[PDB]
Symmetry: C2
């Protein structure tokens, strides 16, 4: 009857509001994991950038103003731009 | 009466089943963003590892005199950059 249908929907509704609660919990932990990975990424990208700047600057400095130095600089450059 | 309240709670229920649907899409999006960041990481870690090997190997040839200056200066600059990257693996 009316009461039975009201009770069944109310039960499924509170069960649904539970899932929403647990899915929001997951989203907050995923937001936290993306944030950590993005903080790490900015740090490592800066170190690789410092190596890239050094490689290109030395390549320019060798040009007008390298023997074994140029050979090493080119070996580093090939490591940076390799695709795997 | 009872029909009105049944209609209002059924509407709340189907609306909440739609939010679970959209929250599951967000989770799949977030799983995809964590996966991309972890794939980048493995690739850039591999390059750092290869630069470390190269830096130490050529330092061994400069130390154990196998060249008969500016090269050692450059090798040491790279090594300091690599050490600073190792130092920030906790921070």
């Amino acid at each position: 009857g009316p009461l039975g249908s009201l009770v069944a929907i109310q039960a499924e509704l509170t069960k649904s509001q539970e899932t929403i609660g647990s899915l929001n919990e997951e989203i907050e932990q995923y937001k936290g994991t993306v944030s950590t990975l993005e903080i790490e990424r900015e740090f490592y990208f800066n170190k690789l950038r410092d190596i890239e700047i050094l490689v290109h600057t030395t390549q320019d400095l060798i040009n007008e103003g390298g023997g074994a130095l140029l050979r090493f600089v080119k070996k580093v450059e090939s490591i940076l731009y390799a695709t795997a």
